[PDB]
Amino acid sequence: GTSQWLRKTVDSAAVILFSKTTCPYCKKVKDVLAEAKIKHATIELDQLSNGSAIQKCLASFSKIETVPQMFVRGKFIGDSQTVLKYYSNDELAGIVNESKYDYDLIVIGGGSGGLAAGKEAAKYGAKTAVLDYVEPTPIGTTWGLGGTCVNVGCIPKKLMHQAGLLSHALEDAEHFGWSLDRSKISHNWSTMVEGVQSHIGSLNWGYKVALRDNQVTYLNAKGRLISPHEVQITDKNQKVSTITGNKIILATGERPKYPEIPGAVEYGITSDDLFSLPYFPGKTLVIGASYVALECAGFLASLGGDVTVMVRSILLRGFDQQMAEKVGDYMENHGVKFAKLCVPDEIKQLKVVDTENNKPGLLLVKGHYTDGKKFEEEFETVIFAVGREPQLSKVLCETVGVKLDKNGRVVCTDDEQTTVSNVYAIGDINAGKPQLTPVAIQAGRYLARRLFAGATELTDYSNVATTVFTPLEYGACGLSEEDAIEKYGDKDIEVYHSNFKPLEWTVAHREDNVCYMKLVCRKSDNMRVLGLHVLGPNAGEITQGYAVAIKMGATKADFDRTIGIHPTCSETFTTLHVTKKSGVSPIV
Amino acid sequence: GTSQWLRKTVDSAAVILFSKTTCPYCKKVKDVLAEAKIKHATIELDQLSNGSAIQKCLASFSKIETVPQMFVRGKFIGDSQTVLKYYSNDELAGIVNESKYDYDLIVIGGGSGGLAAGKEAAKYGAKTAVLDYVEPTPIGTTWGLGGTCVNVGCIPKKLMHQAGLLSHALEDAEHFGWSLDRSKISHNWSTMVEGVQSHIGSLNWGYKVALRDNQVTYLNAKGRLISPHEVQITDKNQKVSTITGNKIILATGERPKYPEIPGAVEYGITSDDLFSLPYFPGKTLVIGASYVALECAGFLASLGGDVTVMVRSILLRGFDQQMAEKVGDYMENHGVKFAKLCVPDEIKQLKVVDTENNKPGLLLVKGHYTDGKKFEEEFETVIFAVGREPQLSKVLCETVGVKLDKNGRVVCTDDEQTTVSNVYAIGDINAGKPQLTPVAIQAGRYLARRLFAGATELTDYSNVATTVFTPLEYGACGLSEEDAIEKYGDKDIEVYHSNFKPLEWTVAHEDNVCYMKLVCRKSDNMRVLGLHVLGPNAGEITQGYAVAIKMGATKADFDRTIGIHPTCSETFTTLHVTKKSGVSPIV
Ligand SMILES: Cc1cc2nc3c(=O)[nH]c(=O)nc-3n(C[C@H](O)[C@H](O)[C@H](O)COP(=O)(O)OP(=O)(O)OC[C@H]3O[C@@H](n4cnc5c(N)ncnc54)[C@H](O)[C@@H]3O)c2cc1C
Ligand SMILES: Cc1cc2nc3c(=O)[nH]c(=O)nc-3n(C[C@H](O)[C@H](O)[C@H](O)COP(=O)(O)OP(=O)(O)OC[C@H]3O[C@@H](n4cnc5c(N)ncnc54)[C@H](O)[C@@H]3O)c2cc1C
Ligand SMILES: COCc1nnc(N)s1
Ligand SMILES: COCc1nnc(N)s1
Ligand SMILES: COCc1nnc(N)s1
Ligand SMILES: COCc1nnc(N)s1
């Protein structure tokens, strides 16, 4: 029924007004609340299909059936006359601030999702605290508010990716008639790092301002859920206390793993350290083969570093393997070396990091290949990118009763709820969800709208598009080719594909047949597009809009009947015709 | 119903075979035709939903109801025994070349649409000729096969744009840590033009190879339609002759206009001349305000030139006017000067063009502003971008009966047919269609499939997306904002909008110049009627969304899709400020 919607809304909301748009009785209660510096949500009943039934159900609480009606934290406050009887008597602040807990909402985690949920909750009148603390890395690195993307993730990595792209810009400029000689131009690592850290510092500051201007309490404190409604916090001075909240959101993210081998923690670094490193890495070994490892190797080479990637098995496990091979081939051709089917055994120190003179150390790496032969080479810097994990034992006492999966992530329902009914989890620690910043933001915002404004919208987690920012970018939306075959059978999968060449590469004398795209389609379902894949420049900008068409169920015919924009790389999707079954070449 | 399809299909097809995939007798006839190099179309009756009706209806032509049946130019040739008999007896080649006309298809015009139409028809066995001739510009400029885009349009204009974009990329490089100093780097015009002309030459060559390998006859001759089936050709040696064809496609495009003022033809140039000009233009006056005018003024500025645009009234007439003003404001902050509400009266010559030393001349331009005040300035080069027109009197005798609208364009039904039943028109001269290269290509290809392979798919001309390649690009798909209010009323229109800033612009040091909006319809589930974005890589951004708009996308379809981070395009997935709210769109 409607009755248990209405009654979840009233129960959970902080301050909420049931109202209508034509009623000037409601319009005067609003203006009172605005000037009184009171935030609230507002269900306009004349714009809901079944506003009539809701008016009746309000009477179960208030014994009346008209509008406006104001509730605070589950209790009916009054109608239009009673609100002004409280206002002019100056009894209104004591009533709107009445609560069994310190906060309506405590977010443990000040990253992508944490800050996004906190700000949206506060819009609708919820008393909100946001906790953030950055445990330092083994060598001591630390940073400010905003989470992993803002400080040591998407933002600093794409900015260094852009710095790497601009070396090809300097090469190309010669052929388009500019008088520079790229031969005599070199890169300065620490000038880059200063500009990058300057931008991050402005996001740190901007988030503190945003929280302040939304009346959100920010505590730079480590938090721990000790009971369903109690969060124990620790100061920067080591002072412990306890705060209480009605709803809890866990949004604490992950940190990089190290392999269990001698020397790794003591002498290597991870991505957490790379984006503010005060010396150029020098001769670098990257261990691992995820998108983090290949993206960092890619711009290290483009800035002129001597870069090696040690690969256990394959590149980009979980991604379309034909495209992953195309990515790796391009990198191998443009400076990155690979040591294939190889694994490390220990890291030995030969020289200590020189802090005063700003120089890396010197390390000796010992490893072995799957056949048996030995790996032994010296590097100045060794970077581990062997995956990320959460440490929920630090965040969450086991007696609270929040269930975790065998990987240590939180098992949630489809509306982010944990096994404890007032506790939710969003972002990287939610089991089974894609680990991406815009996913966490969308989840956090939609959930706050459900707890405090009566919203029903859920987050849709399927067919979320991605881009890997390797020297040649790789964008994808949907199934990889081998997953669609495995799920529907090779006879039911048709794949259209083609090479291409950006117009911008013609005068520049770049390669003819390295850029590549394909559509993986289901025959028996009107050639429905199951996955889209593209290797080339600006692959993120290319892929993104097609994610809407695929969310709507696009078919091959939908692509055929749409006309291209000329000249672009993206238009090549609108005229594809060569099937893989056919055996015809895809070259240009 | 099905009946009238199969009679239209049999009459216009050149060589066509009706068959079934599972039939070894049809396979036997296919294998004979491959070996004899006899190109043909093929209808596979067992993959069509009314193949049974078609099968019975073939008997009205062939007095049989079995497959495989082969036709040539409206005549039943036989079943598998009759065809093999012809093969074995050496009679099959003469039968399949029997024609009342010289060609199954004559295309007049070897540009974007004509080449696409020509190459596609040949795949189905049509005996095809393609005609192309380039009348020179007033100063003598001419070029090779491929049309306006390939030679004096999209392809050279975007390479030159690209040259201009690299100048800001050299600036940005310093801030991201590269040692270069932008201040001591300069641009060589003739080096660029050589690289551009070299790529165009490779396209000229590749199209000639393409026509050769499809057995299309290429005649570098001017063609004129003198009767429904007769095309008069004139040689590069002025030899005149007449060829005949069953179906005629007109695809002759347009050329730039000149204003009727003294000195304009004698001392100015147009875009036709600019992309192969041997000298740098110098101080340039661009007259006009279309996307050609603004794109060219744009890269000439970025390459270091002193550039002025003379605007009669507004910029980008017919495009969303708020977006056009943003496009022009950005150009004005980055070098381009504007002479607003202004029109030219005459061009006077001060220095002739110096061919020996490779230098432009010198000109005095006189004009007036709308209030009467006078304009008088000196420039080395004057570029007219005051529109384009067909000249179908050069193409089409009046007595053939092909009807034209009041602009001289061809009035066509929604299958590209003219008032004469064997004559079709495609591309720029098709009245009322967006004048774009992918549109011409799609129309020429789809039409050839209907004339010669029994296809029925029409070309969809609605909601075709565009990009204007100004220094900051402007992508668009669907109705402008003012157009949508005119059609549905202000109360039924919601506009969501936001400024944004590329991540690449942060370390490189404007905050709120990039902009995008969605124009929606309240009473139709908030249906997206127009998408607009100003920013970098706007074509790459806009294109994919054109599929979702074609499928009828709403605001909720945009909200429920997750973004790709960090990108510019992802800002479309989280828009929330409305124009009626009065809230500011900056970030
Ligand atoms: C190198 C790298 C590059 C990436 N690039 C991209 C990209 O291009 N695009 C993309 O979409 N995603 C990218 N990601 C993934 C993206 O960063 C994550 O999906 C996202 O940051 C997860 O958000 P979150 O809110 O769940 O966690 P986080 O952003 O990690 O925020 C959690 C915060 O809570 C803090 N915290 C932890 N424990 C406690 C505690 N007990 N008390 C208080 N605070 C605590 C953490 O220190 C942190 O500040 C990248 C990740 C990495 C590592
Ligand atoms: C500066 C500029 C930039 C442009 N940029 C873009 C862009 O970025 N994207 C886009 O989509 N569109 C762009 N266009 C438009 C695009 O060029 C046209 O839409 C396209 O060329 C139309 O093709 P068409 O086949 O109709 O004609 P055309 O390509 O003009 O082909 C006509 C051909 O027929 C020849 N011909 C004429 N008369 C005869 C005759 N009697 N006998 C034989 N041959 C004859 C002509 O000389 C020419 O070779 C641009 C146009 C210009 C001028
Ligand atoms: C539990 O760690 C104590 C803390 N140190 N710095 C903070 N900001 S909180
Ligand atoms: C998830 O696998 C982590 C690793 N990758 N490369 C290694 N050598 S260990
Ligand atoms: C009037 O034009 C005669 C020509 N015909 N084809 C050429 N190449 S010159
Ligand atoms: C034929 O000329 C008409 C014009 N169009 N734009 C101008 N500035 S003058």
Numbering used by the authors:
A (entry chain B): 6 to 593
B (entry chain A): 6 to 514, 516 to 593
Which sentences from the paper describe this structure?
The S. mansoni TGR (SmTGR) (EC 1.8.1.9) is a homodimeric flavoprotein with a head-to-tail orientation between monomers. Like all mammalian TR, SmTGR is a selenoprotein carrying the amino acid selenocysteine (Sec597).
Among the 768 fragments used in the crystallography-based screening, a set of 35 fragments were identified as hits. The whole dataset corresponds to a total of 49 binding events on 16 different sites. Sites S1–S9 were observed having multiple (> 1) chemotypes bound, while sites S10–S16 bound to a single fragment each.
